[PDB]
Structure formats: C-alpha cells, structure tokens
Symmetry: C3
Subunit: 289 residues, 3 copies
C-alpha cells in the first residue's frame, strides 16, 4: 500500500532590518508531500519506506525533488529504522514545545548543532553516504529513543566521527518529563549535548514547561527556556522567555496565538525577539491534506 | 485529500529544414502529472496546493522534477492564489483558441512576452524568488482575473519591475467576448500588452473568432488572428490565418483536425506556415488519465 | 487512472577488500516508486505512461528524481512502446534467472554492454535525446520482442549508431527456451551480442538451466552459465557456476537462499565469487508495496 499526505502553509514573514536593499517583509510558503509505502504481514511485522518532497520559497532552481529514503520494520511496539532516520535528540517530547507562529519557530529551541531527519537533497554532496540506524520503543506512556548516525558509511570508521544519541520521555495526565543526550552531535568531535525538560498541565486548558540544555560546543553555552500556553475555545495563546550563557546576550522572548479555524486548518501568528535583539513577526495559515 | 491526474502525448513533429545535420522529423512526447492537495472545511472555504511534474523529449538530464508550488484559498466564487500563479493574460478565454495539432500550437497565438504559470524548475536561478498573487472571480458567466507577479520578492521593490495584469471574459450560448491588459509584462519596463477577442457560435457545430493583440515591445507589432473550427461527429476541423505588423512578414496560416477516439483520447494533426515562412507539421495522440 | 506501486529493500553488502580506507561491509538500500497513468477505452485499446522515482544508497546529492517517460499503446496482445523503452535483450525470459541474494546479482549474468530501460536521470547529458521504439507480442506462451533505440534522435541518422534487437521465448510446463540477438548493442559499432538459453523444470519444486552468450566486443568473450534452484516450502536454494573465454579468468560461482516470510516480503542472502576472484556476500530483505 502507498499513501500520500502533507500540508501547505503560506503567510507573511517579517524580519526587522533584514539587510541592505532587502525587503523586511516577504511571503513565505512551504509545500510538503510525504510518500509512504507500507507492507503489513499476518505475522504482525510491518515494513515501511518513506520519501519526502518539500518545496520552500527561495529554494534553488524553483524546483522540488525527493530526499533520501528512510526504511523501517515494526513489531510489538519496537521500531527499527534505517537510512535517513529520525534521531533521538530531535524526536524526544517537550524539546520543541515553545515553538509558535505559522512557521513553528522559537529562539527558546536548542541552540546546538545535531543530526536530524534530512528533509531535502543536499547539493554540497555532504549527505551522499550518510546512513543512520534508529530504534524506538514505546512502553506504557514511556518512549525510549536510540539513534546512531554515520556521516559517511563507505569510509573506514576510525576516520569518521559517528553520532550516538539516546533519549526518553514519560507522561501521565498532568506531568511530563523528558531527557536526551547525544555525543559527537552533528559529527563534531566533543560536541556533547544534553536536554532535560518538564511540563505541568495545570488545567485541562493550560500548560507550563521548562527546558534546559547543554549546547555542547555552540557559543550559546547552557540555555533555559520557560514557556506556557493556554487554550480558550478555538484560540491558543503561547509565550516563552529563553536565556543563554553567552556573554552579552539579551533575553529572548515571544508571544503568539493559534486559531483552529477547522479540522486541518490552523491560523497562527507571533512576535518574537532574539538573543541579539533581532525582531521577527509572522502571520499565516497551515492546512493539512 | 491528495489527487493525481495528468496526460501523456506522443507523435511525430516535423520542422522543414530544421538545421544543419539535424533530423527534420522527430518523435516529440510529453508526460504531465499534477499533484493536488485540498483541505475542505464546513465553513465553505477550500484550501489547496498544487505541484506539477512534467517531462518533455529533449529535457536536460533525461529526468523529471517538480516545479514551484502554488497555493489557493476559495470561498463563494472568489479564489486567491499565491506563489507560482496563473496570470490574467494567460488565463482569459479565447486567446489560445486557434491552437491545433497534437502539441496545441499556432502562429496565431500572441507574439509577446509575459509571465505565466511555470511548468518546471529553471536551472538559471531566475525564478528562485519569484512570487505572484492572483485573484479570480466568476459571476454569472463573467470571469474577472487579476494577477501581480514579483520576479524577486526578496529585493527592495523599487529595484524590481513587477507585472500587473487584468482580464475579463463573458459568454452566452452564441457570442463570447474577452479582453486583457498587462503592464510591464514579463518584468520588462514598458512592455504593455493587450488583447481583445470575440467569437461567434454560428451553429451547434461551428465557431469563428477574431483575436487582436498589442504585442508591446515585441518586434511583431500589432497582430490579428482569424480562426474557425467545425465539428462533424467525432472529427473537428480547424483553421486560422494570422498577420503581424513587422515589415516583410508573411501571413501565417494553419489547417488541422482532431479525432475524438474515445473519452480521454484525442488524435490530432496539423500543417502550419509561419511569419518567416517556416513549415511545420505534426500528427499524434493525447490521452488523459 | 493513476496507480503507484514499488518496493523497498535494505541489508548488508560485503565486498572483500573493497578499497584502501574503505569499509568492506556497508548497508545497501533501495527505494523504487513506479507511477503509472493508464487510459482504457471501450474499443479495447489501452494507453499508458510510466515514470520511475528510484533512490539507492550513495546516490549523488542524497535526493531522488524521476527518470524519462515511457509511453505505450496495447491492443489484442500487441504492445507498442515509445521513449524510455524496455529492450529485447533485457526483456527475454531466462537470461537473468541465475540472480540471487537480496540485490538480485550474479556473475553468471551476461557480461556485454547493451541498452535497457533507464531507471534514473543521467547527469552527463548522454540520454537527453535518447528515444526508443519497442513492440512486443505474446501468442500462446510465446513472446516476440523487438526494440529499436536511437541514442540521439535529433541528429542526422547516418551520424549516429542505432541499436536493433530481437528476441523470443517459449515455455510449456516443463521446458523453456529463449534466444535474443542485438546488433550495435549499446550504440557501439560492431558490438553484436546474442543469447541462447534453456531451462528444465525437473520437479514441481526445482529447475536447472543453461544460458550461453556471445558478449560481442566485451573482453569477456563467449560465456556459459549453468544454474539451478530448488524450493523446500518457503525456502528456495539457488546456485550457479559461470565461465567466460577471457584468458586467465577464474570460474565464477554463487550459492544463496531466499525465504518467503510473507506475501510481498522476501529475505535473501548469497555468497559469490567472480571471474577475477572477487568475493562478495549479501543478506537483506525486500518488501513490495
Ligand atoms: C537528484 C535529485 C535532484 C537533486 C539534485 C539537484 C542538484 C543540483 O545542484 C547541482 C550542483 O549545483 C549546486 C546547487 O545550488 C544549491 C542547491 O540547494 C540549495 C537551496 O534549495
Ligand atoms: C514590530 C512588530 C510588528 C511588526 C510590524 C511590522 C508590520 C508588518 O507586518 C508583517 C506581517 O507580520 C504579522 C504580525 O501581526 C500579527 C501579530 O501577532 C499576534 C499576537 O500578538
Ligand atoms: C496586488 C497586491 C498588492 C501588492 C502588494 C504585495 C504585498 C503582499 O502582501 C499583501 C497581502 O496579501 C497576500 C498574502 O497572503 C497571506 C496573508 O495572510 C494570511 C492569513 O491570515
Ligand atoms: C531541485 C529540483 C531539481 C531541479 C534541479 C536541477 C538542477 C540542475 O542544473 C544545475 C545547474 O546546471 C544547469 C542545467 O542545464 C539546464 C537544465 O534545464 C533545461 C532543459 O530541461
Ligand atoms: C510538407 C507538409 C507535409 C509534411 C511532409 C513531411 C512528411 C513527414 O511526416 C511528418 C509527420 O507529420 C505529420 C503530417 O501528416 C498529417 C497531416 O495533417 C492533417 C490535416 O490536413
Ligand atoms: C523500427 C522502426 C523504424 C525506425 C524508424 C524510426 C522512425 C520513427 O517513426 C516511425 C513511425 O513509428 C513510431 C511513432 O509513434 C507515433 C505515431 O503516430 C501517432 C498516432 O497517429
Ligand atoms: C531534472 C531532474 C533532476 C535531475 C537533475 C540532476 C542534475 C544534477 O547534476 C547537474 C550536473 O552536475 C553533475 C552531478 O553528479 C552526478 C549525478 O548522478 C550520479 C549518482 O547518482
Ligand atoms: C567470506 C564470506 C562470508 C562473508 C563474511 C564476512 C562477514 C561479514 O558479514 C557481511 C554480511 O554478509 C552476509 C552473509 O551471510 C549470509 C550467508 O549466505 C547464505 C547462504 O549460504
Ligand atoms: C548501533 C549499532 C552498532 C553500530 C554498528 C553499525 C553496524 C551496522 O550493522 C549492524 C546490523 O544492524 C543493521 C542493519 O539492518 C539490516 C540487517 O539484516 C537484514 C535482515 O536479515
């Protein structure tokens, strides 16, 4: 069986004083198509393959291509994936929950470098022999994630730096906890990064969370992000404040809202301020198909 | 929801004396696949996204890729589109109705340069930041079309020439009228082009039309195309004669036929003569899937 | 109508002493997606178009694109195809039946060069004007195949070498016979290649075959491949031995097995030795979707 799903989004993206002779406000848009082939067996083992075709405004050549494939095998809650895999530090819960606006962004997201599923081709040739192995396991609200990424599997392994990550999250109705650790993140020797997060559902309607990061070799240093969101009918309000250790950095903050227009259609906007005082704002719509 | 539709065509394409050491007759063929994602809401607003994957014989690399995306929102007869849009001068009725043969061509089509939906990627980099906005509205047999195309939306707007177009068409059972006007067509300063057309259904079976064009900065000058078609059961006969103002140009003319083999399958051919005395002929088949 | 089908495969590929500073064992994987548009008529004539999107580990840019299109028309057992066609020497029965392992390979396959369906784009530009015509006809267990491939249909034909192939196969329940001949194979003057094969079903369970080849201008010279396979429930065992005329060459051989895990899911492995003493081994899985 082959299925196709995806989403389109479009809207206004504003970057205060973007650059000499550049428009500060542009129309930023994305089309994402996922192609998923699955083979289900009577033994209870599923086999799957996936490809993505994603286009963003500004993409080179004004064209769209597929990325590199991802393969998986699932049995009894355990999934093993190979090729262009989802990594542990990118897949744990909570770590991206401060994101807001129609482009789902936040200065409160981790400021480190690490491997993650590659959405598109890479014209530099850097990903041509990149291959990962991932293993996930979900047991009674607890998820274990493990990933191993080799940037160039064809070359002798003592000559390449491979990335190893581990993560877990846990949740009941009110509290969630998550943690992740990745060594030699992004293929960079000694770039060991870590994440510890927690969130509290303080109402059926609202949540408050705190994420902490060790950003490894990044200049940001350790980081803390406090965020919250509250739902009023179809409207959700979101906010966050984030601080990094880099000397002289400002406190980053953001405020936004989402409006659930219909099933599959979400209108969102945000106003945010970064660590170097950048001022960014967005307003747009996402529709899932 | 995601749907896929398209067409294939193949046949013989003849160009008298095409070039030194070149075959005059080649097998010309096209495969077009449209990928359309749509999100329908109970509020009566539809959201859609589309991508095209088109291959033509002779295409570089012997490969096929997707183009840049187009997004739209529709409500109550009004449609607003963004990104790789259909433009007013390209979408009005009547303007392409002299086309014939299996490749739908005619020297009687407008000889000007103007923006239009881009079917494929562009390796030059010219379309990387191209973005348009279009608005259509159909009211009781009358269609209004408006388009705005910015060739590079990232650069300050006083440094780029944007294209603005407007068009309308109107029809009852017997007569149709259409007009279009576009300023700075194709992003070229002062290339202001215009179109006025009319057609008369003089039988259930036949139609005769006249299209007039102001081709802006093109060397063709003003142009007039007289065309007609007549259906005899499953066979349609078509003809046209076109004249341009360019000094020394010949009168262009064409004669062709279509045969509706089955629903979705059309066999067509034509013999045509251009403004510089070029002699072209084609015979082939198109099938819709 | 448009349909999508394909397969994914992944596994371990071992090449003894692959190269200085190279890993001998890598994870080799493939994703293949076929897009087929078909138009069926009440006259009994079917029209179809196909495109392929295939990704393999190691592919340049870590991206996937479509190949060049293939078109066909079918009526009463006869099929005529145009564009990126299947060729006679590649489509006859028996010629590939010694293949084994999850990558379906064998040193006992023909060692000649010849045109065949192109699975992907070609960045060299060599296939940009490549166009073939093929005609197949299946009559009571007998298949006739004819193919004509012009490497560059735009250039005068006396300047290009075109490939012409013919083939036939025939089978009853117990015996199969096949033969093929192709002149100027692969567009190389005087590279005339030929194949004669036969197979004997010596049980409901097992088959033994012999393929003979004239490899044209290849350095391999004439070649003979003896192969056999035997099925024990869901497990199939396969073997082959092949010899070429090239002076000094070793006898190539291979042993492997397939295990039919479920409908659409096959686990296969092999150990093989080539004409230059190369040692190769594989183990992996293929799943069809
Ligand atoms: C195989 C799938 C198609 C992907 C191949 C595209 C290869 C294009 O580039 C060739 C090398 O030239 C460099 C391109 O410029 C950078 C492209 O990507 C960046 C923005 O989207
Ligand atoms: C200085 C911050 C405001 C940016 C003003 C520049 C105006 C240009 O419009 C850019 C489009 O950006 C959309 C912002 O408006 C939506 C606000 O956010 C909603 C929650 O408070
Ligand atoms: C012909 C239009 C005037 C030319 C100015 C172009 C300026 C661009 O944007 C103006 C707003 O219109 C278009 C964008 O679609 C996104 C709107 O916001 C999303 C839903 O809340
Ligand atoms: C991103 C989707 C894939 C489209 C990228 C293809 C980029 C290829 O070119 C890289 C630059 O080299 C120039 C190519 O030659 C012209 C190609 O198009 C013309 C005929 O179809
Ligand atoms: C000089 C005009 C005729 C072209 C003769 C060259 C012959 C080569 O065949 C090219 C294939 O072109 C197809 C034309 O035949 C179909 C005719 O048009 C039908 C309506 O009158
Ligand atoms: C082996 C064939 C002889 C090699 C000559 C190649 C010459 C090419 O064209 C000959 C005609 O056949 C093929 C084309 O398919 C399109 C036919 O017209 C369309 C339906 O009316
Ligand atoms: C038009 C569909 C996209 C296919 C175009 C890709 C063109 C990329 O290359 C541009 C020229 O540079 C050379 C590329 O390196 C070789 C690529 O293929 C070999 C391994 O998969
Ligand atoms: C020397 C031949 C054995 C190769 C040993 C190297 C070991 C590395 O593993 C490579 C993965 O290859 C899979 C082979 O094992 C499956 C055997 O074939 C099955 C039928 O006899
Ligand atoms: C974290 C794993 C240890 C890193 C070593 C990477 C070595 C790679 O392969 C080890 C085996 O695992 C993965 C491959 O999936 C294919 C297995 O065989 C197919 C079914 O019989």
């Amino acid at each position: 069986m082959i299925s196709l799903n995806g989403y389109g989004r479009f809207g206004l993206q504003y970057v205060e004083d973007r650059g000499v002779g550049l428009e500060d406000t542009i129309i930023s848009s994305r089309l994402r198509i996922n192609i998923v082939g699955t083979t289900e067996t009577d033994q209870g083992v599923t086999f799957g393959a996936k490809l993505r075709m994603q286009w963003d405004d500004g993409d080179a050549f004004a064209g769209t291509a597929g990325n590199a494939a991802q393969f998986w095998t699932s049995y009894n809650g355990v999934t093993v994936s190979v090729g262009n895999v989802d990594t542990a530090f990118d897949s744990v819960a909570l770590t991206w929950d401060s994101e807001m606006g129609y482009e789902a962004s936040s200065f409160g997201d981790a400021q480190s470098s690490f491997f993650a599923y590659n959405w598109k081709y890479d014209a530099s040739g850097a990903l041509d022999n990149y291959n990962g192995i991932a293993v996930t396991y979900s047991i009674s609200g607890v998820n274990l994630y493990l990933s191993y990424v080799d940037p160039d599997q064809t070359v002798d392994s003592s000559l390449v730096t491979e990335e190893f990550g581990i993560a877990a999250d846990w949740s009941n109705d009110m509290i969630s906890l998550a943690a992740a650790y990745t060594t030699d993140a992004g293929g960079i020797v000694d770039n060991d990064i870590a994440f510890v997060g927690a969130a509290y559902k303080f109402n059926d309607a609202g949540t408050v969370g705190l994420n902490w990061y060790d950003n490894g070799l990044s200049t940001a240093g350790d980081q803390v992000t406090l965020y919250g969101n509250y739902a009023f009918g179809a409207t959700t309000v979101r906010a966050y404040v984030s601080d990094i250790d880099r000397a002289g950095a400002d406190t980053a903050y953001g405020i936004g809202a989402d409006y659930q227009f219909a099933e599959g259609v979400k209108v969102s906007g945000s106003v945010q301020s970064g660590f170097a005082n950048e001022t960014v704002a967005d307003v747009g719509v996402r529709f899932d198909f």
